[PDB]
Structure 1
């Protein structure tokens, strides 16, 4: 099955360089164009450029906005795509996607990764502090405090709990983020059976479990 996975994104200092990776499988790689697109959080998609297929000589084109500063390459042995970025600015902070591409005629062959978050900032990386939020139905929560950069991911019971969950958009403040997640379950479930929020902050190699307990 067609796979694309972006990686190599995280925090980089302004003026820095950073190369993103995009591994692919499940289709004849060299037959497709490969494209890079970005999206500042809460903003709009911006096409960045592409590298063409084998028959087209693997040639490259770029958005005027990044011609001369970003470089696109592909390793046809690893079926890997790459985006080399230089002189990074706060404005370049975005989720970056790779997507399968081809001549305009075959638009329907588009297939995207889930992206990776690149935060350009001089702020220092900081792991999250996770606190439990105890009170017929009942609401529990988890406070995720004092971490940088985005992102963190919050699950309840490792993903078994998708219903009644409100994970809130992180918020910056003095170069530190703070987000929160509430889950609303029946009274017969908690505190009879455990409710545990699972917090992952990759950029600080952190994984924190937190059980919610009464009193």
Structure 2
């Protein structure tokens, strides 16, 4: 099981600086180039740089867009990869991936991390309020939701019954208004299963270390 995991992402002031991390495992870290790739929400992937393998001296190269301003390093005893970002602007706001790169032969990014989201804003970390969307109607199925309102920055995660409600879920893209995000998540279950069996939304906002469970009770 090759795994790549980015961390260090979150809210940063414009002009500020930030270091991201990429933890790797399940392959000989030292034999591979590793690259960093970013992506503004709704936009395209931009390659930022790589660091070569052992055989090639762990040397770095950068794209013209961030060259002289971003810095890649690796910890070969830990199988870790870093990106150091300086003098940030809102253009730098993006999900950042680390990807396994060249091994000396293959020309592919065979594996990618899940990405960590960076938001460059003077706005402040605001935790979310979480509201229960309870109905009542009737039908053979019933729809419930949670309203996640007034948080900053992105992202939040929403699960239902701790992930054991996986189908019938629609989590909607957040909308920004007056520097705050609001999104909702819907779940559809058999009318027969609710409210006999409980339905709970679990919302997380790691920027503010917020964790909320919200049980959906009949009004």
The Cα shift of 1:110 comes to 1.8
Native 8 Å contact 2:102 2:108 kept in 1: no
Superposed CA deviations along residues 123-151 of structure 1, whole A, max 9, x for unmatched, are 00010100001112111010000000000
**Which whole-Å CA distance do the structure 2 matches of 1:104 and 1:25 have between them?**
19
The Cα shift of 1:108 comes to 4.2
Please name the residue that 2:175 is paired with.
171
TM-score normalised to structure 2 length: 0.96
The Cα shift of 1:78 comes to 1.0
The Cα shift of 1:109 comes to 5.8
**Which whole-Å CA distance do the structure 2 matches of 1:147 and 1:202 have between them?**
11
Superposed CA deviations along residues 84-120 of structure 1, whole A, max 9, x for unmatched, are 0001011100000001111584024621000000000
Native 8 Å contact 2:32 2:104 kept in 1: no
Matches within 5 A, 1:1-215: 1-102=1-102, 105-108=105-108, 110-135=110-135, 136-215=140-219
Superposed CA deviations along residues 159-183 of structure 1, whole A, max 9, x for unmatched, are 0001111100011111100000011
Q: Which runs of 5+ in 2 are unaligned?
A: none
**Which whole-Å CA distance do the structure 2 matches of 1:6 and 1:109 have between them?**
16
**Which whole-Å CA distance do the structure 1 matches of 2:155 and 2:182 have between them?**
11
Q: What is the count of residue pairs matched by the alignment? A: 215
Superposed CA deviations along residues 6-53 of structure 1, whole A, max 9, x for unmatched, are 000100000110000001111111100010000000000000000000
Q: Which runs of 5+ in 1 are unaligned?
A: none
Name the CA shift for 1:43/1:104 in 2 (closer, same or farther; >3 Å): farther
**Which whole-Å CA distance do the structure 1 matches of 2:74 and 2:186 have between them?**
42
TM-score normalised to structure 1 length: 0.98
RMSD between aligned alpha carbons?
1.0
The DSSP-based 3-state class of the residue aligned with 2:108 is: helix
The DSSP-based 3-state class of the residue aligned with 1:188 is: helix
Runs of 4+ in 1 over 2 A off after TM superposition: none
**Which whole-Å CA distance do the structure 1 matches of 2:30 and 2:133 have between them?**
51
Bigger helix share: 1
The Cα shift of 1:3 comes to 1.1
